[PDB]
């Protein structure tokens, strides 16, 4: 009879409980205290204008209907008690295809404190949208957002809040970085009020500041382009009595410029504007073509 008391506590706790009604439905506003622990900042896809993130998402609020009194002061319950109580319906405003992991059991955490405070934690992978401006590609810096709030509960019903100081709420782990191409500089949280066709909602925004690393595009594209330009400029030191030599020089370096440019266009998305690499490739191609026409003139 050591676990019968806890079964009685849990049964009495949910006896007369409506999980369709938020705490304080016509009496108060539900204040949800949010916290995010980023366990890994996943890869940022530039062709889809998206990024991946893996988070422990914690939400705390206070339900006066879940007050108890027993031999324990905190009930660390399963992930099936959360489906029998009211939990907030947080969604990600700019999410594409997120996953809430349930291996091997639903990765959810529910803790009820004897005064009625609940801590509800989830482990989930979010695939969010990051609208990028690629004018300065590949020397660009972005602020990838992550906006969340409540679906269907307006500002007069559910308001969000950070559990600690806003500069210390969204916490990224140190070894948690799956970034190959970027560099996570810092985080930046924000709070606002969005307005949609159903009312005004509270939105908690997080910005992750990324700075692309250039060391790949340098060796891949910028150094072959400069090498091809130098190899085209080599031709100016050959004697004009040998026309096929300089002819095959010019035309074959133009062909290589074409090969590098075609190879080079698979890196970036199909943006309609010119990036910085596009300007560099255009000027280098112009130099190669100018060298060849100069040979034609001589």
């Amino acid at each position: 009879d050591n676990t019968t008391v806890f079964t009685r506590i849990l049964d009495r706790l949910l006896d007369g409980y409506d999980n369709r009604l938020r705490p304080g439905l016509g009496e108060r506003v539900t204040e949800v205290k949010t916290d995010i622990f980023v366990t890994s900042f996943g890869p940022v896809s530039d062709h889809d204008m998206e990024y991946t993130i893996d988070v422990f998402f914690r939400q705390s609020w206070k339900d006066e209907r879940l007050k108890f009194k027993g031999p324990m002061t905190v009930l660390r319950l399963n992930n099936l008690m959360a489906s029998k109580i009211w939990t907030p319906d947080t969604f990600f405003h700019n999410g594409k295809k997120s996953v809430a992991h349930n291996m091997t059991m639903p990765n959810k955490l529910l803790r009820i404190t004897e005064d009625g405070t609940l801590l509800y934690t989830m482990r989930l992978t979010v695939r969010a949208e990051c609208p990028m401006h690629l004018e300065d590609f590949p020397m660009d810096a972005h602020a990838c957002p992550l906006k969340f709030g409540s679906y269907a509960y307006t500002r007069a019903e559910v308001v969000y809040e950070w559990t600690r100081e806003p500069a210390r709420s969204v916490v990224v782990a140190e070894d948690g970085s799956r970034l190959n191409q970027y560099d996570l500089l810092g985080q930046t949280v924000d709070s606002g009020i969005v307005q949609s066709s159903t009312g005004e909602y509270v939105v908690m925004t997080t910005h992750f500041h990324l700075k692309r690393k250039i060391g790949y595009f340098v060796i891949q594209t910028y150094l072959p382009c400069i090498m091809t330009v130098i190899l085209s400029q080599v031709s100016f030191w050959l004697n004009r009595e040998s026309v096929p030599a300089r002819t095959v020089f010019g035309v074959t370096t133009v062909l290589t410029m074409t090969t590098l440019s075609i190879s080079a266009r698979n890196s970036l998305p199909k943006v309609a504007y010119a990036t910085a690499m596009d300007w560099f490739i255009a000027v280098c191609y112009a130099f190669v073509f100018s060298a060849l026409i100069e040979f034609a003139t001589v």
Partner: antibody, heavy 116, light 105 residues
Framework: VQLQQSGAELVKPGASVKLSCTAS????????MYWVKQRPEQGLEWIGR????????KYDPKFQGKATITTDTFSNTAYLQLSSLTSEDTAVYYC???????????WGQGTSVTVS | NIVMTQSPKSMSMSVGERVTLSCKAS??????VSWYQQKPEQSPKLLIY???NRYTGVPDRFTGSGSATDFTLTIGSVQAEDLADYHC????????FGAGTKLEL
């Protein structure tokens, strides 16, 4: 809804004082509790922060090691203990409650601490 | 430690006109800047929270305008009881206040 602080008093240079702040109308285990210090005709300066539900505290680097904030949830009170006092501690100390987008909406009445 | 620089330190004006106070941050504080009003020998009272959010019990003549670094409090059609000290304080990190701004008639 209401924060009740203690009464003004004097203290000898080099002693220690313990100021109290009794809350009525809410539970201190729900919000954070801030201690703010104001000098005569100067700006406010934040001393420290306590989370009464968990118990962890933070302090301003200027007040780190000099002040110690503690709480008592039974009597719904928050305490600020100052040690190794000096003459530049003559100020008015406020006890504030966090709430509504980190704003410190509810303040106390302020206690005048004078060092003679 | 985020520093808040408020400007100006003092302002003399008559009754009824529009007045504007400015506050600047060293680091980023994203709409977590509160505006308090403190009368002499009293405790500060919250006027504006967030960056533009009137506290429940404040008149409509106070309005806040926010950014990432530059914040301002504008009072249109001031009255005879709006003379006090005004502090801007950030809450994005551990809270730090500004130097203050006396407002006299």
């Amino acid at each position: 809804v209401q924060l009740q602080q203690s009464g003004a008093e004097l203290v000898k240079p080099g002693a220690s004082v313990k100021l109290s702040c009794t809350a009525s109308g809410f539970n201190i285990k729900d919000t954070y509790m801030y201690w703010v210090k104001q000098r005569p005709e100067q700006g406010l300066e934040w001393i420290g922060r306590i989370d009464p539900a968990n118990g962890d505290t933070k302090y301003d680097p200027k007040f780190q090691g000099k002040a110690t904030i503690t709480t008592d949830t039974f009597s719904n009170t928050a305490y600020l203990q100052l040690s190794s006092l000096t003459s530049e501690d003559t100020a008015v100390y406020y006890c504030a409650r966090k709430g509504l987008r980190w704003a410190m909406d509810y303040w106390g009445q302020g206690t005048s601490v004078t060092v003679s | 430690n985020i520093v808040m620089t408020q400007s100006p330190k003092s302002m003399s004006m008559s009754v009824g006109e529009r007045v504007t106070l400015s506050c600047k941050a060293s680091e980023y504080v994203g709409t977590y800047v509160s505006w308090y009003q403190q009368k002499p020998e009293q405790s500060p009272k919250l006027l504006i929270y967030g960056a533009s959010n009137r506290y429940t019990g404040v008149p409509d003549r106070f309005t806040g305008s926010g950014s990432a670094t530059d914040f301002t409090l504008t009072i249109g059609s001031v009255q005879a009881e709006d003379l006090a000290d005004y502090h801007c304080g950030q809450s994005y990190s551990y809270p730090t206040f500004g130097a203050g701004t006396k407002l006299e008639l």
